[PDB]
Design an enzyme around this catalytic site. Structure first.
Site, PDB file in Angstrom:
ATOM      1  N   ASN A  72      89.341  40.762  57.998  1.00 20.92           N
ATOM      2  CA  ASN A  72      88.143  41.528  57.689  1.00 20.92           C
ATOM      3  C   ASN A  72      87.413  40.838  56.554  1.00 20.92           C
ATOM      4  O   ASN A  72      88.029  40.313  55.630  1.00 20.92           O
ATOM      5  CB  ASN A  72      88.497  42.964  57.283  1.00 20.92           C
ATOM      6  CG  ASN A  72      88.545  43.155  55.776  1.00 20.92           C
ATOM      7  OD1 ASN A  72      87.512  43.229  55.112  1.00 20.92           O
ATOM      8  ND2 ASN A  72      89.743  43.221  55.231  1.00 20.92           N
ATOM      9  N   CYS A 135      88.498  40.297  43.573  1.00 23.44           N
ATOM     10  CA  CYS A 135      87.092  39.935  43.592  1.00 23.44           C
ATOM     11  C   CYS A 135      86.801  38.657  42.822  1.00 23.44           C
ATOM     12  O   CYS A 135      87.460  38.350  41.834  1.00 23.44           O
ATOM     13  CB  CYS A 135      86.254  41.065  43.004  1.00 23.44           C
ATOM     14  SG  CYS A 135      86.517  42.646  43.809  1.00 23.44           S
ATOM     15  N   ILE A 196     100.362  44.901  48.307  1.00 21.99           N
ATOM     16  CA  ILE A 196      99.422  43.850  47.981  1.00 21.99           C
ATOM     17  C   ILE A 196      98.092  44.012  48.677  1.00 21.99           C
ATOM     18  O   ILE A 196      97.961  44.763  49.646  1.00 21.99           O
ATOM     19  CB  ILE A 196     100.006  42.491  48.448  1.00 21.99           C
ATOM     20  CG1 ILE A 196     100.311  42.568  49.961  1.00 21.99           C
ATOM     21  CG2 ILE A 196     101.297  42.194  47.692  1.00 21.99           C
ATOM     22  CD1 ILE A 196     100.799  41.219  50.649  1.00 21.99           C
ATOM     23  N   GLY A 270      97.128  51.123  55.440  1.00 22.37           N
ATOM     24  CA  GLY A 270      95.757  50.764  55.729  1.00 22.37           C
ATOM     25  C   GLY A 270      95.434  50.510  57.186  1.00 22.37           C
ATOM     26  O   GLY A 270      95.113  51.433  57.949  1.00 22.37           O
ATOM     27  N   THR A 271      95.512  49.234  57.562  1.00 23.16           N
ATOM     28  CA  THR A 271      95.220  48.777  58.913  1.00 23.16           C
ATOM     29  C   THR A 271      95.789  49.645  60.035  1.00 23.16           C
ATOM     30  O   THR A 271      95.135  49.839  61.061  1.00 23.16           O
ATOM     31  CB  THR A 271      95.714  47.306  59.094  1.00 23.16           C
ATOM     32  OG1 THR A 271      95.015  46.462  58.167  1.00 23.16           O
ATOM     33  CG2 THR A 271      95.459  46.808  60.515  1.00 23.16           C
TER      34      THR A 271
HETATM   35  C1  LIG Z   1      88.842  46.811  56.572  1.00 27.26           C
HETATM   36  C2  LIG Z   1      89.526  46.747  55.158  1.00 27.26           C
HETATM   37  C3  LIG Z   1      88.873  47.148  53.972  1.00 27.26           C
HETATM   38  C4  LIG Z   1      89.560  47.174  52.741  1.00 27.26           C
HETATM   39  N1  LIG Z   1      88.783  47.115  51.586  1.00 27.26           N
HETATM   40  C5  LIG Z   1      89.573  47.197  50.357  1.00 27.26           C
HETATM   41  C6  LIG Z   1      88.876  47.796  49.200  1.00 27.26           C
HETATM   42  O1  LIG Z   1      87.717  48.224  49.214  1.00 27.26           O
HETATM   43  N2  LIG Z   1      89.581  47.761  47.976  1.00 27.26           N
HETATM   44  C7  LIG Z   1      90.915  47.276  47.893  1.00 27.26           C
HETATM   45  O2  LIG Z   1      91.572  47.221  46.910  1.00 27.26           O
HETATM   46  N3  LIG Z   1      91.512  46.834  49.077  1.00 27.26           N
HETATM   47  C8  LIG Z   1      90.950  46.787  50.309  1.00 27.26           C
HETATM   48  N4  LIG Z   1      91.635  46.337  51.448  1.00 27.26           N
HETATM   49  C9  LIG Z   1      92.921  45.909  51.330  1.00 27.26           C
HETATM   50  C10 LIG Z   1      93.904  47.116  51.727  1.00 27.26           C
HETATM   51  O3  LIG Z   1      93.599  48.340  50.988  1.00 27.26           O
HETATM   52  C11 LIG Z   1      95.373  46.687  51.660  1.00 27.26           C
HETATM   53  O4  LIG Z   1      95.592  46.315  50.317  1.00 27.26           O
HETATM   54  C12 LIG Z   1      95.824  45.569  52.743  1.00 27.26           C
HETATM   55  O5  LIG Z   1      94.950  45.643  53.905  1.00 27.26           O
HETATM   56  C13 LIG Z   1      97.259  45.784  53.030  1.00 27.26           C
HETATM   57  O6  LIG Z   1      97.633  47.013  53.771  1.00 27.26           O
HETATM   58  P1  LIG Z   1      97.514  47.160  55.388  1.00 27.26           P
HETATM   59  O7  LIG Z   1      98.361  45.955  56.015  1.00 27.26           O
HETATM   60  O8  LIG Z   1      98.337  48.382  55.695  1.00 27.26           O
HETATM   61  O9  LIG Z   1      96.117  47.183  55.762  1.00 27.26           O
HETATM   62  C14 LIG Z   1      90.885  46.480  52.687  1.00 27.26           C
HETATM   63  C15 LIG Z   1      91.500  46.073  53.865  1.00 27.26           C
HETATM   64  C16 LIG Z   1      90.866  46.205  55.095  1.00 27.26           C
HETATM   65  C17 LIG Z   1      91.670  45.731  56.323  1.00 27.26           C
END
Ligand SMILES: Cc1cc2nc3c(=O)[nH]c(=O)nc-3n(C[C@H](O)[C@H](O)[C@H](O)COP(=O)(O)O)c2cc1C
Ligand SMILES: Cc1cc2nc3c(=O)[nH]c(=O)nc-3n(C[C@H](O)[C@H](O)[C@H](O)COP(=O)(O)OP(=O)(O)OC[C@H]3O[C@@H](n4cnc5c(N)ncnc54)[C@H](O)[C@@H]3O)c2cc1C
Ligand SMILES: Cc1cc2nc3c(=O)[nH]c(=O)nc-3n(C[C@H](O)[C@H](O)[C@H](O)COP(=O)(O)OP(=O)(O)OC[C@H]3O[C@@H](n4cnc5c(N)ncnc54)[C@H](O)[C@@H]3O)c2cc1C
Ligand SMILES: Cc1cc2nc3c(=O)[nH]c(=O)nc-3n(C[C@H](O)[C@H](O)[C@H](O)COP(=O)(O)O)c2cc1C
Ligand code: FES
Ligand code: FES
Lengths: 311, 261, 311, 261
Positions: A72, A135, A196, A270-271
């Site tokens: 993403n 960031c 992470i 998340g995902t």
């Molecule tokens: C579509 C999307 C948007 C997310 N935007 C942020 C965000 O705004 N702030 C942040 O700290 N992490 C963001 N992440 C990272 C997730 O919160 C998370 O740290 C990472 O995707 C790992 O968890 P997951 O495998 O369960 O998605 C984003 C991830 C995705 C896939």
């Protein structure tokens, strides 16, 4: 609306009825998924990143699929502090007054983070802040705040001084050694850690020979990265004395318990929400029986056992 | 629950080159109403976590079934794996989703223009079926790259108050060229124009009918959540570039050229 | 035994009939997989790491499954330079005299690498050396040679001075920024690059609450990491003027072509061999028709097109 | 080709608590001969790339089928997904693999001892069937954690020249305790002892029969390639600790306590 003490965990500023928390950027501000189920079922919510000014984000395509994961390059699109303070957070406070909210904060420089951290705590429902330090730091050539212990520490110190709720710091996995950054962030005053954030990936379109994402690179998430998250969590768990909310590829209750074995106190998802909208409540429902199987009396107990039996 | 269900495959067969028609039966059909909504389909492979957004081509209330027409990629794609499912198989479906085509404010007096292209044609069938009831005047222009990928001709032609016109880029069937050609050929004042197809086709349509307010354009985009939370499927609001329009939630069908919800 | 010019690629010391090369550690020395098919079908082979002295490796469990990937903590088990020089390489030279061999080299200090590099080139069939720099540097507190541009450069310089065949360097993906290491390795004399070696991961057993791997941590490989490899390859491709052999989660011909879109000149296939013993010959068989579909006249042509249309 | 085939599921049913018996038909059966070899099974899930090593319980040449008995884990495991396959389904199989049990040098005079534990019992059935032909004296001691996981009793008892003894840890069937108990009970000079089961059981057996040269021990280990190239399944050679023994290629069955090929 039946609660369960075996699932509740207490973290700084967070008295969670259960450890399940949708991850930032994967649940918006809860307005869409609230249509599928009652948000109070959740332990908390990490809402999408808030930035001082509105952000439209990166051009599209913004996402791509990978083996057991996804990429993403959303670009942290959000309406800005003002709209989030006056509309988004109040909606959650009006409909789910008892649900603690973890406010994700992002920015391009320290000044931006400070501005959001100082203000966002004004919301009655915001009970903690999660600093998104992946960031680019415009004041450091574009380097991510999360790839320099000293830069990350100074950011955390400044933010800690103006925040009115406990400060959590989301660590980036895109580093040679995570220990220095974690130690420095803890030394700087962080109340806890979350980890992470995504890894870095790229996909190419065979017909155009161009990257699938307009941004070229994107953050990699999903089950594919879970082994990396567990590795880093376990590594950081051996050198810090503050709690860790673990995330990265969690898709079921087994993964949540694995996060605990690595040293986590709570678990973000998340995902997986994109694949199954009901994944979080399903996990919450499933945890007790899984804990029974693995001889776990309670998550609070597990956290303590793992903390003392470092192995 | 009402937005997710393990539907049952009633039938599935290839109806055009690499284009399959799947018939699904489930309680979700009951919640359908406006044409243009889509379904978010989970691929039967654990390594493919993102759902595939597929427009609903049509449905049968009484039968409790909906139909979809989709193009597949090679053996490494999700649609390919879906095309293998046979009758009786189950499909994890999320939907119906999105803002579909407006049909309520349509009357047997006004003349409706419908322009479709490639795999964007499927949703236009239910729209046509819908409008047929209003007894309005319908003119359907459909375009395809070649004859081997033409679809739904039988379905469309067999609809009263409908004048079907088909074109192919290589002229292997119907008129030679793109629908854009057949469009310039029409002679009458259109009251509302519904369209769905390749980007270049939408740009051409919304460009020729700029002054038309009742211009309904169905969009496509890369998606993830499919419900409006992740913001992967964004578009700039022609009305306010700052405002982001989400194809999955705000769309897929919108108003204005550069787009307006 | 029909060859195809559209598939052949010329790299330093490597005149490959096709780009497919089993990755180091996933094909042993070819003696087991030779039972499944004729090794001459392959473009080359990256045999398992050779170390000065024999190495038994790490205790077991040595492997674990992950979502679309796997973890391994084999520990670089091998019979040692002598046995490899007198038995293993000669077997390949006797049965497949025309098959070029890429000799993977590992060690705990620069002295070890130098010893193997100087000697291994004596084998008639060894046409190039691939330095495994993901090994802990005992002379640097255990830090991997691949996580320090200057340390990696000095290692490459010394090795280059004693090697009798072109020197390739396998880069580690476990770094904040890969550009510095790649630039330094190229400046030090490397004839080419291969990437990437594995990421770091951990899995936990829920019943014992202990890591599945005895070594605790393991290298993560398989389709799960392909997006990371593509990202790094593409990144390095923009700043080096030497060829790159790409690897990481390649499981089919589509992945091979994707590796080329990222900037690779040849493609290694590791983990996928474990799932399908015939994966490499299948890929070789499939490439031509896939290239036809994507308008690719030849891989040599593609490499040049990608090199000039940096995008 | 001869080591890999999309076999066909003839049948599959749960025969014990979380223990399934699958019957596979294919040309690979023809290449079977010695008991103790295994099959490397691919899981029908794209996210699970590693094959599952499962001992061959028995086979039927004429029928062209082989049988396996395996324990499943929860819904997130590979075996669980395999247990869902019904008759007619296809299974990606690699095999037969490994060095099995030696039976050629066995005669109707010598007395054979066979000790099995839990899911290590399955391979011992084909061994027993094999030895039955030699008309030798066979004494089978089988152990299980509980009655609900006991398997193959019918198969074993219905074999001539075979004296079956069964034990359960909680004594919910047969003798109470571990096989180790039944072992000390036997009274006769064993010529060869074949064994397969939990590690603790193998250590106990090879410990009591240290001086026995004809001691065949079948091992298990975490595997990857399954053919001897990756070195994931290693053991130290009791004969030379430096020498590594590969369970998949050198084994699964070996000679000596700490192990000797
Ligand atoms: C579509 C999307 C948007 C997310 N935007 C942020 C965000 O705004 N702030 C942040 O700290 N992490 C963001 N992440 C990272 C997730 O919160 C998370 O740290 C990472 O995707 C790992 O968890 P997951 O495998 O369960 O998605 C984003 C991830 C995705 C896939
Ligand atoms: C609202 C909407 C309605 C649609 N209706 C139809 C329809 O009725 N019939 C039809 O044939 N197609 C339709 N599509 C396009 C269809 O969704 C893509 O062709 C399909 O998702 C590509 O998946 P894959 O398994 O083939 O390819 P893969 O390459 O394996 O897909 C991997 C990822 O890329 C996404 N993806 C790949 N390219 C496309 C693109 N062209 N479209 C959208 N996402 C992309 C996939 O959805 C998935 O997340 C629609 C798209 C949208 C947004
Ligand atoms: C030569 C040999 C013969 C075997 N014969 C039989 C048999 O006849 N019947 C039977 O029930 N079991 C047998 N096993 C054990 C069986 O292979 C494991 O129980 C099974 O692989 C675990 O897979 P999973 O899908 O349940 O679990 P998962 O946890 O999903 O497996 C993930 C990975 O761990 C491996 N794995 C997990 N634990 C085991 C361990 N206990 N054994 C080996 N690898 C492990 C898996 O193979 C896979 O690579 C044998 C093992 C070997 C080495
Ligand atoms: C079991 C195993 C053993 C390997 N041992 C080596 C080795 O000896 N030397 C080396 O450079 N890389 C080794 N690697 C790393 C691979 O060669 C490769 O760089 C990585 O696994 C990426 O490709 P893959 O996803 O296709 O496996 C090993 C990997 C595995 C999984
Ligand atoms: S798919 Fe997530 S907002 Fe449209
Ligand atoms: S499984 Fe690879 S050597 Fe045994």
């Amino acid at each position: 609306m039946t609660e369960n003490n075996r699932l509740s965990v207490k973290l700084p500023g967070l008295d969670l009825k259960n450890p399940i928390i949708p991850a930032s950027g994967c649940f918006g501000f809860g307005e869409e998924y609230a249509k599928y189920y009652d948000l109070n079922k959740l332990g908390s919510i990490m809402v999408k990143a808030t930035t001082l000014h509105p952000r439209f984000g990166n051009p599209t395509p913004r996402v791509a699929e990978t083996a057991s994961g996804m990429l993403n390059a959303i670009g942290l699109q959000n309406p800005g502090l003002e709209v989030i303070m006056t509309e988004k957070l109040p909606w959650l406070n009006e409909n789910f007054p008892e649900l603690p909210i973890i406010a994700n904060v992002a920015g391009s420089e320290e000044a931006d983070y400070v501005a959001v951290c100082a203000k966002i705590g004004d919301a009655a429902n915001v009970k903690a802040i999660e600093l998104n330090i992946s960031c680019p730091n415009v004041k450091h050539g574009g380097q991510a705040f999360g790839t320099d212990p000293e830069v990350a520490a100074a950011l955390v110190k400044a933010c800690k001084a103006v925040s009115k709720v406990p400060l959590y710091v989301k660590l980036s996995p895109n580093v040679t050694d995570i220990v220095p950054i974690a130690k420095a962030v803890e030394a700087a005053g962080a109340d806890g850690l979350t980890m992470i954030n995504t890894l870095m990936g790229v996909r190419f379109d065979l017909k155009t020979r161009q990257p699938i994402l307009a941004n070229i690179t994107g953050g990699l998430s999903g089950p594919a990265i879970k082994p990396v998250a567990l590795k880093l969590i376990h590594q950081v768990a051996q050198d810090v004395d503050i709690p860790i909310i673990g995330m990265g590829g969690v898709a079921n209750a087994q993964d949540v318990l694995e996060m605990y074995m690595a040293g986590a106190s709570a678990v973000a998802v998340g995902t997986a929400n994109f694949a199954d909208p009901f994944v979080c409540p399903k996990i919450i429902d499933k945890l007790p029986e899984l804990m029974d199987q693995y001889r776990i009396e309670s998550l609070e107990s597990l956290i303590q056992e793992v903390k003392e039996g470092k192995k | 629950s009402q937005l997710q269900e393990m539907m049952t495959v009633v039938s599935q067969r290839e109806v055009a080159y690499n284009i399959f028609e799947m018939v699904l039966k489930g309680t979700l059909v009951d919640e359908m109403d406006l044409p243009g909504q889509f379904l978010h389909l989970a691929v039967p492979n654990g390594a493919m976590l993102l759902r595939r957004p597929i427009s609903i081509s049509s449905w049968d209330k009484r039968a409790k079934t909906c139909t979809i027409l989709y193009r597949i990629g090679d053996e490494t794609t999700g649609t390919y794996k879906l095309s293998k499912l046979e009758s009786g198989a189950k499909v994890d479906v999320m939907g119906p989703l999105g803002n579909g085509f407006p049909v309520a404010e349509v009357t047997s007096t006004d003349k409706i223009l419908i322009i479709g292209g490639g795999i964007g044609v499927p949703p236009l069938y239910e729209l046509a079926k819908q409008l047929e009831k209003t007894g309005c005047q319908m003119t359907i222009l459909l375009g395809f790259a070649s004859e081997n990928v033409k679809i739904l001709e039988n379905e469309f032609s067999n609809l009263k108050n409908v004048t079907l016109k088909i074109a192919t880029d290589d002229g292997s069937y119907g008129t030679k060229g793109h629908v854009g050609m057949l469009m310039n050929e029409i002679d009458f004042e259109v009251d509302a124009l519904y369209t769905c197809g390749a980007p270049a086709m939408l740009k051409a349509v919304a460009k020729k009918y700029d002054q038309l307010e009742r211009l309904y354009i169905s969009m496509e985009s890369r998606m993830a959540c499919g419900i409006g939370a992740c913001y992967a499927c964004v578009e700039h609001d022609k009305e306010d570039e700052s405002h982001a329009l989400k194809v999955c939630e705000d769309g897929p069908v919108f108003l204005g050229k550069q787009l307006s919800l």
